[PDB]
Design a protein around this ligand. Structure first.
Ligand code: NA
Ligand code: NA
Lengths: 315, 315
């Protein structure tokens, strides 16, 4: 378990900066050298390489990578070079700036990050952009979906693990009676239970719900709700039960079928490589009976593929 | 299931003719009597009432209804009095005579009627007007849309149900590769598959298409085509999968939002009352979470409303 990318042995930031300068200097690029260094260092080490590049090369590593590289390869490398919290912050801003909101990106990040990470994200977003994340969410999404995202962003959830069996039963009972008639869905109920109860409590509510309804909570969420609100509730449930399997499903859906959602593919591979990619891989193979490696290999190409395959770790 | 309007018990054509004559004779009209008779008889019985009116009243029932009644109420009653095939024939001619072609009416009828009905329509159109339906379609529509309508009109479709799994896969595969690039849509492909394959084959192609592309065929039709050609392909797909839901959507779109398309409202309610109105109602409520009855009641008024509500059957 854990991630694929780890801190390098023999790490020499100045030498790595020299390798990267040699790779980019003059016409042409040695992409293999860029990959061979950066995909073999963790995020913290990459920042030390940025620092060493500035002082020993007298140039800006991020500017140089941006100018040298293009398209999806450039996106993966620049994402790799970005500090963890700022990467999340940048991806949320990109999902909202304008436009036709990337609601799936909002859900993926806000449902899956831990409370201290969400706090850091809120803080950094405001510092960087001079606007609150919550305010931007309110302008760019609406209705029940909007209420879910605001709750995740504010941290409207109990962070302890107190278990009252009687309260677990009433929550499950509440969700059951709500499933009784087609007009009877109480989305406010769903929102409140799924966004406010602590993780232990919720894992127990899911077990009790199955017991009294004979249905998994996910089944009823799908039958009873729709749209981005449904997707948001499903992501909270999945991230509570098995976060690596949540990400394995995001990866699958970004590649399977007609077209490729490279922006999601890239973001998940970059953001999870150091955390739980080994787990994501195992869950992917359990769920889909194919390796994640093989999906990446069959759905991408070029240097873009080469670097994704290292973030994947292999097989 | 089936329709709302059925053959009346105790049917006495002469008495009905007397009731209708009394209702119209002299200044003023008893619209409730006209509705109470005609909306409670089926189309075949209405023709027997026309016959009885001629011989026992010595007048022409259709002329008298036309002179007495006006606007949308008159349109529903005269449509009700018209033999099934001639009603279709009249509606197609009305959609084309002149002008700025009612392309939606052409699609609705030609995509939804069964082959023997299309044959009867072609025959009756030529007899009545001295022009072929296909020729009028060619003069009044163009391009790919025109090719679709001509195919539906000629009956260019296999009417058997032979299923070759290998041919189902290649059709789906063909539609997939076509969805790969923005310039890669092969509308000829779409036309040929959707207009020529038999219904069993096609229902299997839709399932396989979803499997290999992860998209419903309707989604790709919308992203890949536009205009009346898109609408025509969507109507063929919907009529293959769930014809009552096709009509429930026509009704919805004729009433929802700004304005009312009474000509479509009337034509669908008249033409489907004896066939599948109970199914249309159920699909309407499933799709829109409101009864069809309530839409009619909230969007029409007067005697026009009264008769539509009986064609709807109620709630
Ligand atoms: Na260069
Ligand atoms: Na009169």
């Amino acid at each position: 378990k854990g991630g694929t990318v780890k801190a390098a042995s023999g790490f020499n930031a100045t030498e790595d900066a020299q390798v990267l300068r040699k790779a980019m200097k003059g016409l042409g690029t040695d992409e293999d050298a860029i990959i061979g260094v950066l995909a073999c260092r963790n995020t913290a080490q990459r920042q030390e390489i940025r620092t060493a590049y500035k002082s020993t090369i007298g140039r800006d590593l991020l500017e140089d990578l941006k100018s040298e590289l293009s398209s999806n390869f450039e996106q993966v490398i620049l994402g790799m070079m970005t500090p963890t919290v700022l990467y999340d912050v940048q991806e949320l801003r990109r999902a909202m700036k304008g436009a036709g909101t990337d609601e799936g990106c909002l859900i993926e990040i806000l449902a899956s990050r831990n409370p201290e990470e969400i706090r850091r994200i809120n803080q950094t977003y405001q510092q960087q952009y001079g606007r609150s994340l919550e305010e931007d969410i309110c302008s760019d999404t609406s209705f029940m979906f909007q209420r879910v995202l605001v709750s995740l962003t504010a941290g409207g959830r109990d962070e302890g693990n107190y278990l009252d069996d009687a309260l677990v039963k009433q929550d499950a009972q509440d969700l059951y009676e709500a499933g009784e008639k087609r007009w009877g869905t109480d989305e406010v109920k769903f929102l409140s239970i799924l966004c406010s109860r602590n993780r232990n409590h919720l894992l127990h509510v899911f077990d009790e719900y199955k017991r009294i309804s004979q249905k998994d909570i996910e089944q009823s969420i799908k039958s009873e709700t729709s749209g981005s609100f449904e997707d948001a509730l499903l992501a909270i449930v999945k991230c509570m039960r098995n976060k690596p399997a949540y990400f394995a499903e995001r990866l699958y859906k970004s590649m399977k079928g007609l077209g490729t959602d490279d922006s999601t593919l890239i973001r998940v591979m970059v953001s999870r490589a150091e955390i739980d990619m080994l787990d994501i891989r195992a869950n992917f193979k359990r769920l889909y009976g194919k390796s994640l490696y093989s999906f990446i290999k069959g759905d991408t190409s070029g240097d873009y593929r080469k670097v994704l395959l290292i973030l994947c770790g292999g097989d």
